[PDB]
Design a protein around this nucleic acid. Structure first.
Length: 63
RNA sequence: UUGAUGUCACGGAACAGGAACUUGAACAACAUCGUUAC
């Protein structure tokens, strides 16, 4: 859990509503550095949460 | 022609059963072709 010099938070993989989300995970997410992804209204984030997306941060277009 | 905080589809052998088989001495003798004459 060390990209270049910063640590990485375990990320959040649990929403509240389930009307969207055509499918859910059944995979047993890989674990490292037991901590908490606490801040929901933050100002800085762990690089994994900058890859997740918490208008768009990183946008993937169609191929 | 997708929408985002959540995709084990490399998560799944086009697989499993059905005799190209059955019947047959490489052997042998009587003709062929039509009209002539009162």
């Amino acid at each position: 859990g060390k990209i270049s010099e910063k640590t990485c938070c375990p990320g959040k993989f649990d929403t509240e509503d389930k009307d969207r989300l055509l499918q859910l995970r059944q995979r047993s997410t890989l674990r490292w550095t037991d901590k908490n992804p606490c801040p929901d209204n933050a100002e800085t984030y762990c690089p994994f949460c900058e890859l997740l997306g918490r208008r768009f941060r990183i946008h993937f277009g169609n191929l």
